[PDB]
Design a binder for these strands. Structure first.
Ligand SMILES: [Mg+2]
Ligand SMILES: [Mg+2]
Ligand SMILES: [Mg+2]
Ligand SMILES: [Mg+2]
Ligand SMILES: [Mg+2]
Ligand SMILES: [Mg+2]
Ligand SMILES: [Mg+2]
Ligand SMILES: [Mg+2]
Ligand SMILES: [Mg+2]
Ligand SMILES: [Mg+2]
Ligand SMILES: [Mg+2]
Ligand SMILES: [Mg+2]
Ligand SMILES: [Mg+2]
Ligand SMILES: [Mg+2]
Ligand SMILES: [Mg+2]
Ligand SMILES: [Mg+2]
Ligand SMILES: [Mg+2]
Ligand SMILES: [Mg+2]
Ligand SMILES: [Mg+2]
Ligand SMILES: [Mg+2]
Ligand SMILES: [Mg+2]
Ligand SMILES: [Mg+2]
Ligand SMILES: [Mg+2]
Ligand SMILES: [Mg+2]
Ligand SMILES: [Mg+2]
Ligand SMILES: [Mg+2]
Ligand SMILES: [Mg+2]
Ligand SMILES: [Mg+2]
Ligand SMILES: [Mg+2]
Ligand SMILES: [Mg+2]
Ligand SMILES: [Mg+2]
Ligand SMILES: [Mg+2]
Ligand SMILES: [Mg+2]
Ligand SMILES: [Mg+2]
Ligand SMILES: [Mg+2]
Ligand SMILES: [Mg+2]
Ligand SMILES: [Mg+2]
Ligand SMILES: [Mg+2]
Ligand SMILES: [Mg+2]
Ligand SMILES: [Mg+2]
Ligand SMILES: [Mg+2]
Ligand SMILES: [Mg+2]
Lengths: 60, 185, 67, 144
RNA sequence: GCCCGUCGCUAGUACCGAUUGAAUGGCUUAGUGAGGCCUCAGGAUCUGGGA
RNA sequence: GGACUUUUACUUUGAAAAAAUUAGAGUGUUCAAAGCAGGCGUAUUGCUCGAAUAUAUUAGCAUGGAAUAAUAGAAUAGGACG
RNA sequence: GGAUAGUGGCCUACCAUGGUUUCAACGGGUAACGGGGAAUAAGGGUUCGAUUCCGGAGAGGGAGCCUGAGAAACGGCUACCACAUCCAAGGAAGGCAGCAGGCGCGCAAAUUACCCAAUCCUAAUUCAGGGAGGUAGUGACAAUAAAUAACGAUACAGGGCCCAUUCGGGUCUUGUAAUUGGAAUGAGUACAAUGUAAAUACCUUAACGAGGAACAAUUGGAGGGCAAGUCUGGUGCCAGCAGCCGCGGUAAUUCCAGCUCCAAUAGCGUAUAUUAAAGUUGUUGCAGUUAAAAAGCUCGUAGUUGAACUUUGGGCCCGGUUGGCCG
């Protein structure tokens, strides 16, 4: 095949995606406390059961 | 040129990495005994695994074969000692059963909670690491201490710390400092 | 706290059967300090290059100071 | 009953036969011929450090249309000349000719990766630092 | 629809190949042969035949 | 003590056998990986449990077995006992 | 016979023609020191062992030898070869695969520190010496324990539940909360004591030391395998991603980001090797009509394998080790 194709466009997309800073948000607990949060989220209180169960929903 | 220091690792990771049935099952335990790791469960499953392997082997030997009798009986009374093996079921075909949860419900972190004294496993953890609660006058700060039956009656707060006399504590005493240095002279 | 104790029949019997670093800790023997360990070793080695006394080599090297 | 000998003294034939046939194992043969140490641009070692000769623009195989940015590298312990992919968006901007780079395998057991033809290595580091850090921002390229 | 080979482009690998090509390592003919040892001598000196 | 003994394979039990590793008992290193400690009192002139066991396979040694599988035997009798 | 401490073609004389081999000699390769062992877990196996203990070998390469009970010794000598240092050019001197440290090599590996206190070794010897060895520094090689938070009040919201003719909240707590509330603790810092040869750390422990600006967890992934979005913005077969299948040519569930979510978590990715998956090396245990594979055919040596039959049946004693019913 060909070997000497342009290199002009190296990093085209990364260089032209608009920066949006990370947001400043609540500090998530680390260690045992995080395993706690997961468990009250996943089993204790429960959220929905739209037929089954969802973990990362948005506009449903 | 000196004797090697011997070590061993004390846990085992599950083969299938992403099996949600097992993953749910593991998390429930984590939040039911106040653990912080999948490893704290991985560990116990390993402890079990060998106890079972041990037992399996003995079972293949003849009823009342010398080794079977000696090491089997020994394995049982060790298990009875800490309260994983119930008294009735005491002849190894049940250790051959057993279960992860039986081992879990004997940790110090859980025994500290099981009879009052904490109310929530997480308070129970925090208490342990923070140098309160003891066995004799011997403070214990490892949540995995595995209460052995005959020390169960002795899980109480330490003679040090608040909660067991001794002293309030430097964050409270600091408040007793701002109390009479504001409202006094 | 758990330690270990000894008690001799005399002060003359400790001073002879005790390790010398211990009597130091107590105050019944001075820490006779010396040069470095590698200062000492070097001196041993420097000393190896001389056969006999030394002063015989002082005078003979003193004649070089004429030539 | 078909195959192999069964007899109690036929141990030898049974071992020999296995010996003879083990050779059809693709991995066994490579091990015993010492193919690694003999062929193969690296020693048989996990990584190899080399020097950048030219920057290539390899055109990718079908059904993919692209230009895979790469480099020609001359392994230092070797003189062996090799071509290696420079992973992630931009990164070729970090390398420059005559520069020193650290090459690794592609995780395919020899063999080329995907649509990149004839490329069996990827970079990993340049001038002592690592693409990954550079691409993010944790580190900066050294002076010269 | 599928599909075979010559011919043409780029890149890669191995092969054959004048150079009686080159290189490293292990043995080795023949020739030359250090050194200590053993041995025939020697005898500065120095004793009572010996050192 | 004398005089003579067809060859083997297999299997059994045992001896001879480094420690560390391994399997594993005992013991609350605070837990544990470890370590081989330690434990009781008159804690003022001491009492005391330990520091196991298993494995250690081919070959050589030693003992039991006599199925399975080989060897040898008397036919030009140069046979067997006395 | 000579030589040796001593057996022996060890060597020399004489004499003979033997010795090994498809049951694989001889030769080649080994990125080969052997072993105890290591990794991998149904079993059978497979891979590894420079390296804490045992044995062997070596001290840049070769050979020679002095001393001595013991060395073919190298922190001994001698020669040659390679290398290499000082010089007043006449000469002299060196051997880190000891400890540390430098160069080189490379993907690849630490202080030119303290001590004989322990463990032990040596000497004429309780004493001296010991980079043996111990101490600390460097050190995410592996291995162990396990912090990054815990508990109440209130403010609506719930689901429980008694009632429901119909307001509803009221007390058993499920908890999502943009004001709240006092508690707890070692990370660190630090008198002191302990530690130690002296130190440092650990174990102890006065004084300090947590409210979001921390004392602020990471590393990868979110189409399938494969646990987690068809969110928003970007790009437009470009840039890039993708172990494998595959995504990207304008509403991208794979790219570049934001948000959110998943998994393991003081750790997690990548590369290379091996092991399990692999009954894809198959003794256990493969496959061979058509998927890879029965020699065109028959003889045949080595090798493997090879029908049946020879003291079997009956009788009597002896003493054990478990288990039943009594104890
Ligand atoms: Mg000295
Ligand atoms: Mg002297
Ligand atoms: Mg073939
Ligand atoms: Mg394809
Ligand atoms: Mg090129
Ligand atoms: Mg080289
Ligand atoms: Mg045996
Ligand atoms: Mg043993
Ligand atoms: Mg002879
Ligand atoms: Mg002759
Ligand atoms: Mg001949
Ligand atoms: Mg063969
Ligand atoms: Mg070698
Ligand atoms: Mg070895
Ligand atoms: Mg080996
Ligand atoms: Mg080597
Ligand atoms: Mg030697
Ligand atoms: Mg060298
Ligand atoms: Mg030579
Ligand atoms: Mg030598
Ligand atoms: Mg030496
Ligand atoms: Mg001169
Ligand atoms: Mg060195
Ligand atoms: Mg040296
Ligand atoms: Mg390293
Ligand atoms: Mg004296
Ligand atoms: Mg000394
Ligand atoms: Mg040292
Ligand atoms: Mg932090
Ligand atoms: Mg804070
Ligand atoms: Mg992230
Ligand atoms: Mg999924
Ligand atoms: Mg869009
Ligand atoms: Mg989009
Ligand atoms: Mg994304
Ligand atoms: Mg992992
Ligand atoms: Mg079998
Ligand atoms: Mg097959
Ligand atoms: Mg076919
Ligand atoms: Mg045929
Ligand atoms: Mg033939
Ligand atoms: Mg037969």
């Amino acid at each position: 095949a060909k070997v000497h194709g342009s290199l002009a466009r190296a990093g085209k997309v990364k260089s032209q995606t608009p920066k949006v800073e990370k947001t400043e948000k609540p500090k998530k607990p680390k260690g045992r406390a995080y395993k706690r949060l997961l468990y009250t989220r996943r089993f204790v209180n429960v959220t929905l059961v739209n037929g089954k169960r969802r973990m990362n929903p948005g506009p449903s | 040129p000196r004797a090697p220091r011997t070590y061993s690792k004390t846990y085992s990771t599950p083969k299938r990495p992403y099996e949600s049935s097992r993953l749910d099952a593991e998390l429930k335990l984590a939040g039911e005994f106040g653990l912080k790791n999948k490893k704290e469960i991985y560990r116990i499953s390993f402890q079990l695994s060998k106890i079972r392997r041990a037992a399996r082997d003995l079972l293949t030997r003849d009823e009342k074969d010398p080794k079977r009798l000696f090491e089997g009986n020994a394995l049982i009374r060790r298990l009875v000692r800490v309260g994983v093996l119930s008294e009735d079921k005491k002849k190894l075909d049940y250790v051959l059963a057993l279960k992860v949860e039986d081992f879990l419900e004997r940790r110090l972190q859980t025994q500290v909670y099981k009879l009052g004294l904490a109310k929530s496993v997480h308070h129970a953890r925090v208490l342990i690491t923070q140098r309160h609660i003891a066995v004799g006058k011997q403070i214990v700060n490892i949540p995995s201490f595995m209460v052995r039956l005959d020390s169960e009656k002795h899980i109480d707060f330490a003679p040090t710390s608040p909660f067991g006399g001794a002293r309030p504590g430097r964050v409270a005493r600091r408040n007793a400092a701002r109390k009479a240095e504001a409202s006094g002279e | 706290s758990v330690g270990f104790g000894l008690v001799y029949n005399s002060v003359a019997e400790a001073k002879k059967f005790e390790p010398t670093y211990r009597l130091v800790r107590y105050g019944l023997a001075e820490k006779v300090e010396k040069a470095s360990r590698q200062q000492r070793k070097q001196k041993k080695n420097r000393d190896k290059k001389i056969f006999g006394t030394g002063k015989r080599l002082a005078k003979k090297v003193a004649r070089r100071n004429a030539d | 009953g078909k195959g192999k000998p069964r007899g109690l003294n036929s141990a030898r034939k049974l071992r020999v036969h296995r010996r003879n046939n083990r050779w059809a194992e693709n991995n066994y043969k490579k091990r015993l011929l010492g193919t690694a140490f003999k062929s193969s641009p690296f020693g048989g070692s996990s990584h190899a450090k080399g020097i950048v000769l030219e920057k290539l623009g390899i055109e990718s195989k079908q059904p993919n249309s692209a230009i895979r940015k790469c480099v020609r590298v001359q392994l230092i312990k070797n003189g062996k000349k090799v071509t290696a992919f420079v992973p992630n968006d931009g990164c070729l901007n970090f390398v420059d000719e005559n520069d020193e780079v650290l090459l690794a395998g592609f995780g395919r057991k020899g063999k080329a990766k995907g649509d990149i033809p004839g490329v069996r290595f990827k970079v990993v580091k340049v001038s002592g630092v690592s693409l990954l850090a550079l691409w993010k921002e944790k580190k900066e390229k050294p002076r010269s």
